[PDB]
Amino acid sequence: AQNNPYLFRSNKFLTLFKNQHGSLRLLQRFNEDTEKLENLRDYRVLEYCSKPNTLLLPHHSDSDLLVLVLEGQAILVLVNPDGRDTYKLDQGDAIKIQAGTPFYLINPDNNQNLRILKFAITFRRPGTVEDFFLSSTKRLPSYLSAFSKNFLEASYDSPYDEIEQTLLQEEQEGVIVKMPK
Amino acid sequence: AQNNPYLFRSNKFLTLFKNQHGSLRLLQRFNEDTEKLENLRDYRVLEYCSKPNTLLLPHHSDSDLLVLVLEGQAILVLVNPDGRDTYKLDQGDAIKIQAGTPFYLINPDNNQNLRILKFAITFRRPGTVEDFFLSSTKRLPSYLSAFSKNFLEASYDSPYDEIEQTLLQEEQEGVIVKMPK
Amino acid sequence: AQNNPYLFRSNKFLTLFKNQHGSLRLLQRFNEDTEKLENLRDYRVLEYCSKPNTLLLPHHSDSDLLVLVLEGQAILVLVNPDGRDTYKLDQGDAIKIQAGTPFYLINPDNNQNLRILKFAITFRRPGTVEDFFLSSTKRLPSYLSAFSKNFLEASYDSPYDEIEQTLLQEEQEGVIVKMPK
Amino acid sequence: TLSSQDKPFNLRSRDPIYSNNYGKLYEITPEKNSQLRDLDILLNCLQMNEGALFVPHYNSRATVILVANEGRAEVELVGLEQQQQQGLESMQLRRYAATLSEGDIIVIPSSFPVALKAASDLNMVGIGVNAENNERNFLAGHKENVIRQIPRQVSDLTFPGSGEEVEELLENQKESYFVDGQPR
Amino acid sequence: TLSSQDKPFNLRSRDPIYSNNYGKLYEITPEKNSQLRDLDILLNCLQMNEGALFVPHYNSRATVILVANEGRAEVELVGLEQQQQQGLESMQLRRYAATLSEGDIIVIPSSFPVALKAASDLNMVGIGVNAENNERNFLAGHKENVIRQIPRQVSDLTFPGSGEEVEELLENQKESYFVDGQPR
Amino acid sequence: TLSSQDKPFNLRSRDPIYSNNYGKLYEITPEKNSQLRDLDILLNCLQMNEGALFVPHYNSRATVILVANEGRAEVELVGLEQQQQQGLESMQLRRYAATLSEGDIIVIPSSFPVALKAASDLNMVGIGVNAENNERNFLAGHKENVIRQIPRQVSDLTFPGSGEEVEELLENQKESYFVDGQPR
8 A cells, every 4th residue: 555666466455344253354546556557546346254144234335336255155135215135145146236225244144254355336436435334333323423403303203312212322343243143 | 716625515606707788607617626526527517697688699619518597588599500490498498509519598578587507518628618709809809810811811702801890899798798689 | 748738739759669661650648748638648649651561570559559541552460369350451441450459560562661540549558558569579579578487388388498489589670570572 | 499399409397206295306317318318417406495304315326416596405415535545433424514595506426315404495406417327215204215124133233222113213204305394 | 351341341431521622521430430430530531732721610529630641731720728717808819820741740629610721732631539429510611601600680799790791701702611722 | 046036136157268177267248247238347257276377368458357266376467568658679578476365466457468377276256347348369278379370471570480380389289278387
């Protein structure tokens, strides 16, 4: 991450978060030190690994992602404003997650761990990817959190007091969690 | 117009010209202070307002414009090398003006004033729009003016003296004028 | 080649190589001093002229080229992994050479000399074009040269000694040569 | 608008995509109109009454610029800033709120949740760029609510309460898109 | 050019788009040829006699690069410079004139009027970029004249003279595209 | 993977494009799959045995990023650097060799010859960008060899030996794409 001529060799992604059950890592911007890669300037790659029986909370990214299964098996969940489409991913499965649809991702019953690769095609903010999470956690909170008392009053038709007890929080081991069942 | 982080709030276009009957204003380049908008870098917005019974002289722009009627009613004129296509625009009309076709635009019989919005999709010169006017005025003159005596002699087959009495001029209240009838 | 406002006038390409039989010249990057041409930033132009009965050795370019015959007549050869497609070009012929296919180009039997124009549409490295030559010459050698002893041993199944006697060399008057027959 | 029809012949309205009471929205997309089809824009007309919150949402692909034709608006935009940053928690969470008004322009990126407030009777024009494919996902309201889709077991895991407790909080608002802004 | 035809098989000529006397123009567009079709280029061959002005015009979309194959040319380009400027009158009006000649290249932006002069017998190649959709509008001549379309009432309002006085000045030149450059 | 099938329904394998012995390659292209079709990517799975050189080649259009899923790889990339340089001989000829390994990523530009070496049993994923239209041209091996196409008279002129002497050197390797890396 910083000033190399023409190096077409990468081995270090920066970590977004990591913990007892998993990790989300993100590669340095391709067009980084070399100018030898302005044609990749828009693409980004994230690696991902969760221990058995874990969860990636619901979230949506601004970038179109092409998900690909390197190791494990997963239960992917694509949520849209009318229902869901759910899928059991296997070593070698590749799925395409459009921008902005929220999705949660789970490693099942296992011993076998989950390693997924995410190739991201960015637009909004060239070579910049951003995910948004519903739930509050210590990394950051809910985007919902960002609104106004009334904004949440009117929208919701529930006093703020009851908006925040399903708003702000202590989900600790953050964005990757251990599942109950 | 100058150095703000991530401000997605704009209220000041710079004026191209203004006068007794009208005005043409142009928004600061979107990708201006924020880097938060490189994806808009190419688009530009102009606002426009003419008093009743006025004219925007004939002109052509290098950029493709998408015209849209906010207030008033207009008579738009699209000139191409074989004739015209003319249209009566109403509150809410949206028309698409290709690049390079000349067009003149008029506010009719009214009391009601004309407010038009122009969303410009640029190419030639990314986020740069340029209109060209036939007639000479104090802002600038005719592009025709720019040529050579002979160039206008040969082309036209009329002495320069008679080229300029339908060339250079005093149309005063400039690019927006009051109509006779 | 360096700092002019808005000059839409170009007359000097830099030479890639030149000699007794020919020449390959390359125009300064369009988006060079003027900013008035960022929309051309990707395109490049090469001129080319060979004396009668000469050769442009086999090579491939990273950029898509659109070849065009200004003067002479040529025998163009398009090589792909299964055979060839060969063509007799005449004053005014225009052919499209995809990226990466190797091609060799020849001026026939003549007195009449060959002048070809190459308009290059770049991608990989915006406004950057690169050709690769099989044969070793004093300009540069074979790309093949760049490999490893074993790499050439395994690949080829011939000792290095016999790889280089059909590898490295003395083709002197370089990339443009005189033909035997 | 002549019977020799066929060009870049002018355009205007159809059934609003979200009419209601509290307010309406008309919207010409690119997939249903040719002069924008090759333009990639989305155009949309937003009309609302004194006090009708446009409820938290975010467009998937489109980046919408909005101008205040008539009225007074309270916009509240929400953000996570630049990923020339490289650190989760190390990011930002920002709320951009402006009371816009006849004249002003608000830019509205493609995934960033938004909510409006119609302080005066409102007329707004939307020029959406990066059109082909846009979807509007809602985080409040009765139709197209997405918080309303995360299954039960997950909601428990996701929001500071629970499966059953989300499902309520959620429909405690029997209204669509534009609702009552009436504070207390 | 073999009967196993079908590729990126080579290309050359058809009826010039503007033949005449004073000069001619051949031009392969992208909409009528596939190897450029996906290339977006326009290719065009311009031949003229000692003294045949190519008369003021401007291409709508295409940006054309022109090389002097054979001859001597007097180009006269016209401009309004950078809108990282923000002021109407505060702009520029420039005339770029060069006598080009076998060797040289002239770049010709998409709306900027141009006129040529064939000082010697000319052969010019045009590589137009931003092709799909280009139109050539003329400001002089008899066919495709555009100053010849602004209606009467408007011409009065537009040019330093009048309705009737434009309509004349205008056809006082019964010729097309390439005309006589003969000065006085 | 449900019988209500039809979406961005997931994808995986078909007949490798190059199976063999020494190793195999599976590869989903954009022209044969829709979720990438509009994505422009090429995806490809590369499996090889302890010691199976992937033989010198270069992709025409596509720029491929490769990650080491499982194993140890010896990559040897070949180059001519920046043409913000303007001088033939005045260029560079570089060889970038890295022994990559489970974790690492190698970027592989579109015309630059490459060769691999499977130091351990290998599993590699290829994410190719700039897909639509890619061709893989080989400089070694029996199938799709290109040094094997330059006609006779030319080879003489091209490589430090001769017509007859190239044609041999060439097929002194009766194998395809992945061959024996066994040194001496």
